[PDB]
Design an enzyme around this catalytic site. Structure first.
Site, PDB file in Angstrom:
ATOM      1  N   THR A 149       0.829  -1.198   0.000  1.00 33.98           N
ATOM      2  CA  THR A 149       0.000   0.000   0.000  1.00 33.98           C
ATOM      3  C   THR A 149       0.865   1.250   0.000  1.00 33.98           C
ATOM      4  O   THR A 149       1.996   1.228   0.482  1.00 33.98           O
ATOM      5  CB  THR A 149      -0.937   0.040   1.216  1.00 33.98           C
TER       6      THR A 149
ATOM      7  N   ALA B  29      -5.449  -4.605   7.077  1.00 29.71           N
ATOM      8  CA  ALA B  29      -6.716  -3.976   6.728  1.00 29.71           C
ATOM      9  C   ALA B  29      -7.692  -4.029   7.894  1.00 29.71           C
ATOM     10  O   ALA B  29      -8.324  -3.024   8.240  1.00 29.71           O
ATOM     11  CB  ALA B  29      -7.313  -4.655   5.497  1.00 29.71           C
TER      12      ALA B  29
HETATM   13  C1  LIG Z   1      -5.506  -1.356   4.040  1.00 29.55           C
HETATM   14  C2  LIG Z   1      -4.858  -2.644   3.550  1.00 29.55           C
HETATM   15  C3  LIG Z   1      -5.707  -3.261   2.443  1.00 29.55           C
HETATM   16  C4  LIG Z   1      -3.426  -2.426   3.056  1.00 29.55           C
HETATM   17  C5  LIG Z   1      -2.747  -3.649   2.441  1.00 29.55           C
HETATM   18  C6  LIG Z   1      -1.452  -3.249   1.780  1.00 29.55           C
HETATM   19  O1  LIG Z   1      -1.267  -3.233   0.593  1.00 29.55           O
HETATM   20  N1  LIG Z   1      -2.518  -4.698   3.388  1.00 29.55           N
HETATM   21  C7  LIG Z   1      -2.193  -5.930   2.997  1.00 29.55           C
HETATM   22  O2  LIG Z   1      -2.071  -6.247   1.826  1.00 29.55           O
HETATM   23  C8  LIG Z   1      -1.956  -6.950   4.095  1.00 29.55           C
HETATM   24  C9  LIG Z   1      -0.458  -6.942   4.405  1.00 29.55           C
HETATM   25  C10 LIG Z   1      -0.095  -7.276   5.851  1.00 29.55           C
HETATM   26  C11 LIG Z   1       1.362  -7.724   5.928  1.00 29.55           C
HETATM   27  C12 LIG Z   1      -0.342  -6.102   6.790  1.00 29.55           C
HETATM   28  N2  LIG Z   1      -2.366  -8.231   3.571  1.00 29.55           N
HETATM   29  C13 LIG Z   1      -3.520  -8.902   3.735  1.00 29.55           C
HETATM   30  O3  LIG Z   1      -3.708  -9.987   3.212  1.00 29.55           O
HETATM   31  C14 LIG Z   1      -4.630  -8.290   4.582  1.00 29.55           C
HETATM   32  C15 LIG Z   1      -4.811  -9.071   5.897  1.00 29.55           C
HETATM   33  C16 LIG Z   1      -4.456 -10.564   5.936  1.00 29.55           C
HETATM   34  C17 LIG Z   1      -2.992 -10.809   6.294  1.00 29.55           C
HETATM   35  C18 LIG Z   1      -5.352 -11.260   6.956  1.00 29.55           C
HETATM   36  N3  LIG Z   1      -5.821  -8.288   3.766  1.00 29.55           N
HETATM   37  C19 LIG Z   1      -6.561  -9.380   3.512  1.00 29.55           C
HETATM   38  O4  LIG Z   1      -6.154 -10.520   3.450  1.00 29.55           O
HETATM   39  O5  LIG Z   1      -7.837  -9.046   3.319  1.00 29.55           O
HETATM   40  C20 LIG Z   1      -8.149  -8.386   2.089  1.00 29.55           C
HETATM   41  C21 LIG Z   1      -9.629  -8.156   2.082  1.00 29.55           C
HETATM   42  C22 LIG Z   1     -10.143  -6.878   2.287  1.00 29.55           C
HETATM   43  C23 LIG Z   1     -11.513  -6.660   2.281  1.00 29.55           C
HETATM   44  C24 LIG Z   1     -12.385  -7.723   2.073  1.00 29.55           C
HETATM   45  C25 LIG Z   1     -11.882  -8.999   1.869  1.00 29.55           C
HETATM   46  C26 LIG Z   1     -10.509  -9.213   1.874  1.00 29.55           C
END
Ligand SMILES: CC(C)C[C@@H](C=O)NC(=O)[C@H](CC(C)C)NC(=O)[C@H](CC(C)C)NC(=O)OCc1ccccc1
Ligand SMILES: CC(C)C[C@@H](C=O)NC(=O)[C@H](CC(C)C)NC(=O)[C@H](CC(C)C)NC(=O)OCc1ccccc1
EC number: 3.4.25.1
Lengths: 233, 232, 212, 200, 239, 196, 212, 202, 233
Positions: free
Chosen positions: D1, D49
């Protein structure tokens, strides 16, 4: 007197005056009627309005898909008891995935209502209920009192001028088993009407009906939805 | 744990304990407060010098924070407890809001404390009434009065304690934009209001003022005597 | 039970037209040692339910005691309501899931059978709270050895009679005794029918060919 | 992000991409990473998120409670302090949150950075996320306190586009917000493909 | 004012609250229990206040365990609370010591629980007297009675209610030590019918229960056929 | 890591600190203030784990101001330092320890200037000069070389410039600007920043 | 002692102009074994909402029970059924209630909004939820998502008219994507369950897949 | 360790070795692992000494209070159940396996096994301890139904002697105890009294 | 010498009756429900000219679509108002929707009658809340008005007056009210009744007025609008 201020004081006649005072509190509420056939249970209640511009107080409250209660007495105690009933039913469904039998719910209500009547500085629940529900053993109608005592009833009426309804139900108890839903509802309404004074009638704005049956989840009928039953007086 | 209902209703709907607290504040010393155009003043009637009591340790005017003070009437000890609680609240507010407290916030906190004390179990109502004055960040002067019942109002001039009615009547008859024209005229108004109750006059007066962006200042006895002479 | 001590082998289950059959060998094994060889691993919960348990036997005793007390307390009321096999299955699932959440699991894997309202019930409860209902069940090493035979027979013939179910259970037990290293010859058969619950004494797999 | 916000003469700009990834799998390309606490205050999301969403929603709840009690709108400093003190109690338990609180209080435009690590610092130019460095490059090379409004919009869009270009875990659409004394307005949401066509 | 607390002793050495609880139980209907060689049999004069109540409402015979019954008199809410307490005690005994609770022990526990409510001003004595009946090969037929004061005594025959004196007089003329349960059910029906008062009380329903060799040590209601035969015999005897 | 420094003279205490706040590899702020005004004549400088520094410093600030209001006279530098040490030591063995490095500077009407050193283990010590962070390793030698108890405030400022110039020449981290303050009988005076 | 176990399962949700589709396979697995072939992962909440759960089966069951209880509580305390948005918000709050012991469940909601139009909400185990027009979760999320993005989203295709999705086309797409997934992913197969949410009600269908 | 109990018509026969080890060092060589829980109930202790002693004392207290409350002799099943409850509740902290034997009028001589984990099973003969693994075959082969008290004593002594010979955690003297209606007849076999089996030489 | 939880022979709680008595000593508050919105008016009851009228907060805002008018003990009403606001915001956070007026009224009412002496809480409440509330707002079911008493009983009211002048204000409301009243007519009628019942003269500084409409949020009339309405009527 010195024997009518605490619920932990026995009168020299073996009476706990506060329990009779709570009974009187129940008897000073609006009148309700409950009756059951071989396949249905009906709760009919007469709502009273504080003023011409105040919505008539509700008296039939949901508990589960197969249990409903009509209240007569304090409203706050009524809501507390209803919340307890709902929590117990939800717990039974969550643990066992089965509806809670009405008798066990009434037993839990009695156990809960006993505790205040034996401890210092606590008051009995000043509310009387009429539980109606359908379980594996057919329809049920139960009556609860502030004395932590309950009875299984074919028909009952509790509230102001409930004795007339009781007399009517006693006179006409024979046909209740073999009666269609409409006939049973009309019988309940007739029982409730006998409680009203001469110069008052059963309008759509002061009558509530609660039906539960084998193929009919508990439903509350109020306002214009009670017109079909009222017709045919 | 004491769990008895000290404050309970009575027929006609009166919390007799709160009425008794009102009587207690009535029997207490006299306090006056006037809201000026650019100054806030507080006056208190000393019961007696006693010629051997350090005036430093009997002050009835206290500073909750830099921009807020208050004078009380009633039982001194309850006043001390309320003052300490209000000071702690002001510090906590500055900590978690990064801005100085407003007069309204602290008076509401004090009123809430008093209400909780007149509805909780096993504890009697506070027996003080407090006049809280100060300056908000916007610079608008303020003056509030709180009662044991927990009711707080914003006044432009009020009196509490013994002879509250007489001083309040004087203030109502002798309050105008003219009298608040200057700071000296405001202090003279406070002294004149107090002199309507205190017998000796001059010697038996405690007076403190706060100006905008200036620390609370207690007028020395010489200054009070000078103003009393000016009034006469 | 963080560390199991005495454990049982697989428990089978197959439902026929008018009941269910459960089989469980009489063995308590302390890590490759047939310490106890005359212990029953099938419970009669009530007149229309049964429960066979694998895994730790002490936890099976605990569940036996709790479930028996619950059934008794229900009966004392005498209100005409019976804990249906589905109710017992749900209660077991909840208890095991709660223990898992607390991090103090009940090391067991049970097979519940019953006959109520003219319908057969066959449930599976895992240590972690996994619950499902299928025509045939097999815990432990049975899932790898016995389950294929039952599933093939059921797919060929969805509805089986009592004798066919018993023969299938006997064949599966024979295979388990052949191939499972923590199995025993003596085993029990339990059946639930409209007549109630019946448990057969210590049977044997004497039909054990050993052409070498 | 990649999310950035800078204070300039006419207010504070806020920008953010809309990509969420679960490892290497792009869960969504339409994630709103700017929360509207109130018409005069808004926050940003970066990191976990779920954590950011939950705690920003709780901050909005608390801010509304403060407004109701005090009859005055909360200040940016107060909101930032509330969030920092609220997330501090869970320090070391794994909360992955990086947020920016932007708004217009009685003391003019505000801009605060709040992290799960406990940081709370104000500033003029901020950028948080995986592509924070790439956005910082362009933002610093093009930032000026006296930027025109359209120039500020272009700077924010270009910074986010470059961060998306150089970062794998950032992409999607460039949301842009502008705060003024009379509240904020969402100006546009331009997809990265269209911006690439425009610039290249 | 020496009779406003269970924690106050009157000058004569009485706890008047317990006396008032005894009077409260004395104002209820009559319940009788006779011990015989095979087992025990219970009988309750279940008065019907109105014809609207179903047959079985306000049941005064409880099963506190597989092998223990309970016949109550007095405030029914207190009776139900004590029945739940007895059930809890039996379950605890089975869980800890691993076998069915002896009746004497259960009587002791419930009596001690009742006695704990006759000492403090924070609780009032239970307004109910109850009897317990159990049968086992090891222990045999047993019958106990517990009063609000907490006194538990074993009985060959007991009667709790307003007609206790009459019931004791009628029970006293039975050779119960040698008769069986079948021959005791009819006598219990006779006694209940005799003690019943028609001028004061309007109508009543007979509730019977027993536990003995014929039942394999289980407490259950007397079957309908046996009960009907007992009522016919009682009516014939009254004539 | 951050940087702190303090020189105690005959009638004053001179303190300075860096103005950098870096998250991972990026200086997110360039004018950070690491000095907390406890009272009219007391300063607290805090460097350490993020969140812990601000929480601890603000807590001590609130407690000191509350003391001042409750009693009417400000706490002495020695009392404030001991209070801080007691709180830190109490929190050391709990489940919420504070990893904060301190430097307390203050002036007293009677006792005079005071400079106090405190580490994250809550070991209080009073020194004529002190420093914190990895920059201390390079500045303590200069302070030992060029320091005299009778040093004027101008000469002390020159010595501080010498230390910061050495930091610029030899240290690896970028510490361009330093905040400088002086406490004397008249209170706290904010001097011009040392910039490079 | 591992408190988790992956039981497989694929979930899909499609939002249309006046309908919502929720689809899931009926295979429950553990390791290399197959527990059952009739374990649908689509659960009906109200007359206009359907929730699909995949992942750890015990946690899925517990979450479904909690959602049902909370729906009933809301109905009792507000005298009106919950909307899809309310369900999504409550589920987000519930999932984050156990952030430190997360629900190993992938959730998906499909139903009508207040205006009568379709809506789909996709969730993560921790609670993050987003309003999407299409989404697939579970074992074969990676296999199903790209095709949906290409076909109904018309991504990476130029000169294509964006006709609104039709119910017949939506059902065909769901069937085709699940058939394709069953060919590659081991965890998905057995049978397919489709729930169609409309104003008339909730219709169900079942089409067989590979048993391999 | 080697603990054993056998059941005959009228009572039970208990037996245990007398070795307590702390590694390869025999801290006590005359230890008594047969503890009287009640007048006619005995427990054989295997596992941790401290855990077994604490459990034995707790069960003795509970059973004595229970006996005083009910004016009747205790039941062996009651003692077994108390041990089972205490071991099952504290299985993670306790390291103790117990064998319970004794006489009660209701069911006569009984033997119960409470191994690690809190199981309880009634057996005709039970063995336990580290050395029990070396006499499983012997007891399985030389056990017969309807044995006499003397025969059971000899059988227990022989099997215990084999266990002491082959196990390094077992040794010392064989402490036998026979419980019946008459009482407890305790015994101690030492020196040449221990059964001897010749060893090979080629 | 009787406890707080004590029942009179007439089946009533003494403390609740006394709390009802205390309501009659408060200022008069009126509310009217119309298809266009809900209006609320109150009497400031100024004692001396030195008291700032702006500090008398008798009409407060629970949310952007709910308002409360109170009479009796204001210090007691503060806690109930805070609870209502917290409940509304909690509902918004959990369900992302606006709480219904009936739900807020029920949540606030549950707090009433939750008082006792023994085994209640470390700082439980000792007496009933001696303050009456008038809730008004717009929900999915349209404009609504509710009345809450110390007993915890809440009823939907088309037009209700609470306070010292309730008896007579209610009579005037009955005389003047009709179902199709417009917002301006409702405001004018409320002002007329308040002028009739107030002891002191009615001006723009000694009354409070608020309205809630489907489009506009909770709005509190300022001096200009109040003066306009006063001149018109
Ligand atoms: C505000 C966020 C979307 C920012 C985003 C960065 O690019 N975060 C992410 O990509 C995070 C990274 C983690 C290392 C903190 N990755 C993720 O995969 C996070 C949380 C999981 C680890 C449980 N998001 C996720 O899996 O959920 C995405 C989602 C969001 C809304 C509805 C359904 C699914
Ligand atoms: C129940 C006993 C009387 C039987 C006796 C015979 O082996 N027990 C033992 O010898 C056990 C060893 C255990 C691994 C079996 N030893 C013990 O209980 C010793 C005995 C000392 C008091 C000398 N103490 C003890 O707590 O164990 C020492 C120990 C501690 C940690 C690990 C391994 C061994």
């Amino acid at each position: 007197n010195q024997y009518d201020n605490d619920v932990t004081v026995w009168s020299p006649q073996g009476r706990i005056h506060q329990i009779e005072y709570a009974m009187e509190a129940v008897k000073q509420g609006s009148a309700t009627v409950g009756l059951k056939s071989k396949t249905h249970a009906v709760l009919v209640a007469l709502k009273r309005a504080q003023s011409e511009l105040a919505a008539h107080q509700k008296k039939i409250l949901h508990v589960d898909n197969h249990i409903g209660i009509s209240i007569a007495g304090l409203t706050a105690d009524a809501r507390l008891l209803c919340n307890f009933m709902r929590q117990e039913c939800l717990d039974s469904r969550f643990v066992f995935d089965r509806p809670l039998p009405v008798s066990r719910l009434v037993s839990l209500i009695g156990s809960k209502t006993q505790i205040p009547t034996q401890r210092y500085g606590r008051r009995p629940y000043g509310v009387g209920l009429l539980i109606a529900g359908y379980d594996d053993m057919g329809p049920h109608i139960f009556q609860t009192c502030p004395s932590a005592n309950y009875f299984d009833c074919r028909a009952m009426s509790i509230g102001a001028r409930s004795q007339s309804a009781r007399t009517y139900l006693e006179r006409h108890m024979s046909e209740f088993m073999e009666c269609n839903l409409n006939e049973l509802v009309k019988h309940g309404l007739r029982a409730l009407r006998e409680t009203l004074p001469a110069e008052q009638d059963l309008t759509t704005k002061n009558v509530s009906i609660g039906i539960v049956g084998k193929d009919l989840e508990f439903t509350i009928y109020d306002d214009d939805d009670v017109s079909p039953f009222l017709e045919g007086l | 744990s004491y769990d008895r209902a000290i404050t309970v209703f009575s027929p006609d709907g009166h919390l007799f304990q709160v009425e008794y607290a009102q009587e207690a504040v009535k029997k207490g010393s006299t306090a006056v407060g006037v809201r000026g155009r650019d100054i806030v003043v507080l006056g208190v009637e000393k019961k007696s010098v006693a010629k051997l009591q350090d005036e430093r340790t009997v002050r009835k005017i206290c500073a909750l924070d830099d921009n807020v003070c208050m004078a009380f009437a009633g039982l001194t000890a309850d006043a001390r407890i309320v003052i300490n609680r209000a000071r702690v609240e002001c510090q906590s507010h500055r900590l978690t809001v990064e801005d100085p407290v407003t007069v309204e916030y602290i008076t509401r906190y004090i009123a809430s404390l008093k209400q909780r004390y007149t509805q909780s179990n096993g504890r009697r109502p506070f027996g003080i009434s407090a006049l809280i004055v100060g300056f908000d960040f916007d610079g608008t002067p303020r003056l509030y009065q709180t009662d044991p019942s927990g009711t707080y109002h914003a006044w432009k001039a009020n009196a509490i304690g013994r002879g509250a009615k007489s001083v309040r009547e004087f203030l109502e008859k002798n309050y105008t934009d003219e009298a608040i024209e200057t700071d000296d005229l405001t202090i003279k108004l406070v002294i004149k209001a107090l002199l309507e109750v205190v017998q000796s006059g001059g010697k038996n007066i405690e007076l403190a003022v706060m100006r905008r962006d200036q620390s609370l200042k207690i007028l020395n006895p010489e200054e009070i005597e000078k103003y009393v002479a000016e009034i006469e | 039970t963080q560390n199991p001590m005495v454990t049982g082998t697989s428990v089978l289950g197959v439902k026929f037209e008018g009941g269910v059959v459960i089989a469980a060998d009489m063995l308590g094994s302390y890590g490759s040692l047939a310490r106890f060889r005359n212990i029953s691993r099938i419970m009669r919960v009530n007149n229309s339910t049964m429960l066979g348990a694998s895994g730790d036997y002490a936890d099976f005793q605990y569940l036996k005691q709790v479930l028996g007390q619950m059934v008794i307390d229900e009966e004392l009321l005498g209100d005409g309501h019976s804990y249906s096999p589905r109710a017992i299955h749900s209660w077991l699932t909840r208890a095991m899931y709660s223990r898992r959440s607390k991090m103090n699991p009940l090391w067991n894997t049970m097979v519940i059978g019953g006959y109520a309202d003219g319908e057969s019930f066959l449930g599976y409860v895992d240590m972690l709270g996994v619950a499902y209902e299928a025509p045939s069940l097999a815990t432990g090493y049975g899932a790898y050895l016995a389950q294929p035979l039952l599933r093939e027979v059921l797919e060929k013939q969805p509805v089986l009679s009592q004798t066919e179910a018993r023969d299938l259970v006997e064949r599966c037990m024979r295979v388990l005794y052949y191939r499972d290293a923590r199995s025993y010859n003596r085993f029990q058969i339990a059946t639930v029918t409209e007549k109630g619950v019946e448990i057969e004494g210590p049977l044997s797999t004497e039909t054990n060919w050993d052409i070498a | 992000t990649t999310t950035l916000a800078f204070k300039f003469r006419h207010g504070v700009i806020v920008a953010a991409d809309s990509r969420a990834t679960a490892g290497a799998y792009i869960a969504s390309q339409t994630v709103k990473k700017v929360i509207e606490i109130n018409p005069y205050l808004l926050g940003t999301m970066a990191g976990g998120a779920a954590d950011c969403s939950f705690w920003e929603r709780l901050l909005a709840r608390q801010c509304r409670i403060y407004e109701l009690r005090n009859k005055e709108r909360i200040s940016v400093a107060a909101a930032s302090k509330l969030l920092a003190n609220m997330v501090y109690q869970y320090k070391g338990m794994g909360l992955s949150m990086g947020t920016m609180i932007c708004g217009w209080d009685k003391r003019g435009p505000g801009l605060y950075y709040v992290d799960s690590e406990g940081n709370r610092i104000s500033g003029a130019t901020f950028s948080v996320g995986s592509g924070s460095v790439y956005a910082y490059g362009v933002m610093d090379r093009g930032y000026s306190y006296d930027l025109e409004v359209e120039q500020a919009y272009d700077l924010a869009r270009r910074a986010i586009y470059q961060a998306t270009y150089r970062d794998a875990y950032s992409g999607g659409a460039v949301n842009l917000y502008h705060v003024r004394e009379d509240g904020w307005i969402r100006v546009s949401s331009d997809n990265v493909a269209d911006l690439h066509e425009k610039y290249s | 004012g020496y009779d406003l607390s269970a924690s106050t002793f009157s000058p004569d050495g009485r706890v008047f609250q317990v006396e008032y609880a005894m009077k409260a139980v004395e104002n209820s209907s009559t319940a009788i229990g006779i011990r015989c060689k095979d087992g025990v049999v219970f009988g309750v004069e279940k008065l019907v206040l109105s014809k609207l109540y179903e047959e079985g409402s306000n049941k005064r015979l409880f099963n506190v365990d597989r092998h223990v019954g309970m016949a109550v008199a007095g405030l029914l809410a207190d009776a139900r609370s004590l029945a739940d307490i007895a059930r809890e005690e039996a379950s605890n005994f089975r869980s800890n010591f691993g076998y069915n609770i002896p009746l004497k022990h259960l009587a002791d526990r419930v009596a001690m629980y009742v006695h704990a409510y006759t000492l403090y001003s924070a609780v009032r004595p239970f307004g109910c007297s109850f009897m317990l009946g159990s049968y086992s090969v090891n222990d045999g037929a047993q019958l106990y009675m517990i009063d609000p004061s907490g006194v538990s005594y074993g009985y060959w025959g007991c009667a709790i209610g307003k007609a206790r004196q009459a019931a004791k007089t009628e029970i006293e003329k039975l050779q119960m030590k040698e008769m069986t349960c079948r021959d005791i059910v009819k006598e219990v029906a006779k006694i209940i019918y005799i003690v019943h008062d028609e001028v004061k009380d309007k109508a009543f329903e007979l509730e019977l229960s027993w536990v003995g060799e014929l039942t394999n040590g289980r407490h259950e209601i007397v079957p309908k056929d046996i009960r009907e035969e007992a009522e016919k015999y009682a009516k014939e005897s009254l004539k | 890591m951050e940087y702190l420094i303090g020189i105690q003279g005959p009638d004053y205490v001179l303190v300075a600190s860096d103005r950098v706040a870096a998250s991972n590899i990026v200086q997110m702020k360039d004018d950070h203030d690491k000095m907390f005004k406890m009272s009219e004549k007391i300063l607290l400088l805090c460097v350490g784990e993020a969140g812990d520094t601000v929480q601890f410093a603000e807590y001590i600030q609130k407690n000191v101001q509350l003391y001042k209001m409750r009693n009417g006279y400000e706490l002495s530098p020695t009392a404030a330092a001991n209070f801080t040490r007691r709180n830190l030591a109490d929190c050391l063995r709990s489940r919420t320890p504070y990893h904060v490095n301190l430097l307390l500077a203050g002036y007293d009407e009677h006792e005079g200037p005071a400079l106090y050193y405190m580490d994250y283990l809550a070991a209080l010590a009073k020194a004529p000069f002190a420093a914190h962070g990895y920059g201390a390793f390079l500045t303590l030698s200069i302070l030992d070389r060029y320091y005299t108890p009778t040093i004027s405030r101008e000469r002390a400022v020159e010595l501080l410039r010498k230390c910061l110039e050495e930091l610029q020449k030899r240290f690896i981290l970028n510490l361009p600007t330093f905040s400088v303050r002086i406490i004397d009988k008249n209170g706290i005076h904010d001097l011009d920043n040392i910039s490079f | 002692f591992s408190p988790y176990v992956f039981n497989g399962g694929t979930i899909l949700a499609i939002a249309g102009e006046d309908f919502a589709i929720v689809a899931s396979d009926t295979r429950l697995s553990e390791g290399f074994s197959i527990h059952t072939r009739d374990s649908p992962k689509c659960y009906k909440l109200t007359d206009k909402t359907v929730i699909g759960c995949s992942g750890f089966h015990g946690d899925c069951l517990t979450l479904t029970k909690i959602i049902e209880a909370r729906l009933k509580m809301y109905k009792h305390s507000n005298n009106k059924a919950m909307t899809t948005g309310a369900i999504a918000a409550m589920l987000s709050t519930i999932l984050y209630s156990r952030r430190f012991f997360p629900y190993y469940v992938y959730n998906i909601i499909g139903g009508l909004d207040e205006e009568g139009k379709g809506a789909v909400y996709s969730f993560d185990p921790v609670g993050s939820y987003q309003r999407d027009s299409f989404k697939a979760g579970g074992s074969a999320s990676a296999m199903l998502q790209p095709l949906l993005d290409n076909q109904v989203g018309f991504k990476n295709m130029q000169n294509v008219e964006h006709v609104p999705l039709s119910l017949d086309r939506a059902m065909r797409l769901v069937k085709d994507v699940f058939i394709s997934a069953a060919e590659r992913d081991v965890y998905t197969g057995d049978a397919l369950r489709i729930c169609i949410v409309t104003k008339e009600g909730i219709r169900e269908e079942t089409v067989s897949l590979r048993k391999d | 360790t080697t603990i054993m109990a056998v059941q005959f018509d009228g009572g039970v026969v208990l037996g245990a070795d007398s070795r307590t080890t702390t590694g390869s060092y025999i801290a006590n060589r005359v230890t008594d692992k047969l503890t009287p829980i009640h007048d006619r109930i005995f427990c054989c202790r295997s596992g941790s000494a401290a855990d077994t002693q604490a459990v034995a004392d707790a069960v003795t207290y509970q059973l004595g209070f229970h006996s005083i409350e009910l004016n009747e002799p205790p039941l062996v099943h009651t003692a077994a159940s108390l041990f089972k409850e205490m071991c099952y509740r504290y299985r993670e902290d306790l390291m103790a396996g117990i064998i319970i034997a004794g006489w009660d009028p209701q069911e006569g001589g009984q033997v119960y096994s409470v191994p690690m984990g809190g199981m309880m099973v009634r057996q005709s003969f039970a063995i336990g301890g580290s050395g029990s693994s070396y006499i499983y075959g012997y007891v399985d082969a030389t056990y017969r139904e309807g044995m006499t008290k003397e025969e059971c004593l000899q059988f227990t002594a022989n099997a215990l002697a084999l266990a002491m010979e082959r196990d390094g955690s077992s040794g010392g003297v064989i402490r036998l105890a026979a419980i019946a209606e008459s009482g407890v007849e305790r015994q101690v076999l030492l020196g040449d009294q221990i059964p001897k089996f010749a060893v090979a030489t080629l | 010498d009787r406890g707080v939880n004590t029942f009179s022979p007439e089946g009533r709680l003494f403390q609740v009756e006394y709390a009802i008595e205390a309501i009659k000593l408060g200022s008069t508050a009126i509310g009217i429900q119309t298809s266009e919105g809900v209006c609320l008016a109150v009497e400031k009851r100024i004692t001396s000219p030195l008291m700032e009228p702006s500090s008398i907060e008798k009409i407060v805002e629970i949310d952007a679509h709910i308002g409360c008018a109170m009479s009796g003990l204001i210090a007691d009403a503060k806690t109930l108002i805070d609870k209502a606001r917290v409940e509304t915001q909690n509902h918004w956070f959990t369900y992302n929707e606006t709480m219904t007026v009936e739900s807020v009224t029920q949540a606030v009412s549950n707090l009433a009658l939750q008082f006792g002496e023994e085994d209640a809480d470390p700082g439980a409440m000792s007496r009933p809340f001696g303050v009456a509330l008038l809730f008004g707002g717009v929900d999915e079911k349209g404009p609504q008005l509710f009345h809450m008493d110390p007993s915890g009983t809440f009823v939907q009211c088309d037009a209700r007056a609470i306070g010292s002048a309730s008896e007579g204000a209610q009579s005037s409301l009955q005389e003047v009210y009709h179902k199709s009243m417009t917002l301006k007519e409702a405001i004018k009628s409320s002002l007329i009744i308040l002028k009739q019942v107030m002891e002191e003269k009615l001006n723009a500084t000694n009354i409070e007025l608020a309205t809630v409409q489907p489009g506009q949020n909770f709005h509190m009339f300022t001096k200009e609008e109040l003066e306009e309405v006063i001149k018109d009527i």
